[PDB]
Ligand SMILES: Nc1ncnc2c1ncn2[C@@H]1O[C@H](COP(=O)(O)OP(=O)(O)O)[C@@H](O)[C@H]1O
């Protein structure tokens with residue numbers, strides 16, 4: 001079984017979100033479970049410089065110009081690079097320049113990634129050819145379309161990490177990307193008058209996966225599918241739609257082992273987490289106080305995440321004795337909003353705007369509650385990290401969050417399954433009730449500790465996940 005993941009990020013080389021963490025870990029898991037997984041990424045500079053044993057495999061002209069295909073290893077997995085510097089040799093984001101605008105040639109940049117992914121099914125590498133091309137999100141969405149145009153020399157799976165990003169390009173571009181003009185159709189890649197790379201993935205793949213069981217269902221609803229629910233419902237009935245929950249990488253997210261933390265700790269020695277708390281309080285500039293719950297946020301700041309509700313509920317949170325530590329980047333309305341909040345309530349709100357990998361560890365390791373109050377959430381790795389760090393997650397019952405967190409309800413406490421806090425509707429009031437709940441639990445320290453241990457007993461394993469994908473790759477044959 002040979003699989004090629006086609007995608008545009010991979011931790012630790014280049015990461016803008018959860019996709020990178022999946023790509024950084026799933027292939028190794030799959031290899032453990034007896035699938036020969038390789039990864040194909042565009043040669044962005046950070047990726048290129050991480051893969052130091054990369055040799056030339058071949059060299060092609062292409063509708064977007066010349067690529068030289070490289071192959072190397074990284075962390076014991078086979079990595080293919082699309083080396084096309086006129087497209088990819090640009091600093092910073094895969095997706096947009098330094099003043100946050102999509103590169104005007106994105107349509108070529110990502111069509112090519114899709115294209116190379118499909119060429120591998122046909123022998124671009126004379127020595128290795130995948131049986132399944134596994135494509136991730138809109139960036140790799142044309143790969144199944146290129147594969148359909150060639151008569152499907154390999155079976156394809158497209159997995160949606162997030163339905164909200166649709167990869168829309170002007171229809172004329174049908175002219176620049178080398179696909180049959182016939183593919184521009186509602187039964188194909190056309191979507192609301194433009195080209196959709198997402199639609200191309202959803203339509204042309206042999207099978208579609210979402211990154212959690214409940215999100216696989218939610219995307220058959222209009223509330224989450226944004227116009228695609230028609231395709232998704234059909235594809236559901238055909239048995240071509242499923243969810244496979246993400247794992248977490250234990251090499252990099254485990255308090256037992258985590259070298260970025262002031263102090264390491266375990267499910268049985270939670271006393272050792274205290275010190276991470278003091279240090280976080282200091283670093284953020286909060287009153288150093290162990291008698292008080294410290295809530296935390298680590299996320300992209302965009303409407304998806306519900307953070308404006310956190311903002312809205314903060315007075316109520318502070319009024320009960322709580323602290324807030326925030327680390328995140330995006331919506332300047334939110335950035336500014338949160339910065340304002342920290343100014344107004346110094347010593348009880350700390351806020352670092354920006355992206356800092358290592359500091360998210362120091363937060364995960366130090367806080368009592370991580371807040372993930374998403375409007376929608378295909379998986380959400382941060383609450384999985386909070387579970388593992390025994391920092392209890394406070395989430396909205398949607399997507400992966402619904403799949404992975406159990407509320408402190410009396411049944412749940414009694415069955416020994418409660419692992420955090422869940423609220424139901426997208427508004428400050430509904431969130432504030434979960435906040436109150438956490439204040440109540442906090443005043444029953446035994447119970448808090450009991451829930452902490454259950455949180456830290458949940459297991460999110462990539463090798464378990466691999467097995468599900470393996471089953472899929474065999475069903476498609
Ligand atoms: N400001 C930040 N600094 C460091 N890491 C961040 C920041 N924002 C998000 N992350 C990380 O990115 C990942 C977020 O992935 P996830 O929870 O799946 O949501 P999404 O894929 O929608 O970003 C987590 O590993 C989280 O720690």
Ligand SMILES: O=S(=O)(O)C[C@H](O)CN1CCN(CCO)CC1
Pocket residue numbers: 016017018019020095102137161162165166167
């Ligand atoms: O914003 S763009 O449409 O131009 C590009 C990407 O969708 C940015 N991402 C990568 C995938 N994401 C969701 C899963 O990690 C975060 C947004």
Ligand SMILES: OC[C@H]1OC[C@H](O)[C@@H](O)[C@@H]1O
Pocket residue numbers: 017018019022161162211246377378379380381400
């Ligand atoms: O696929 C992993 C991550 O990627 C995309 C989603 O936005 C997020 O919920 C998920 O955790």
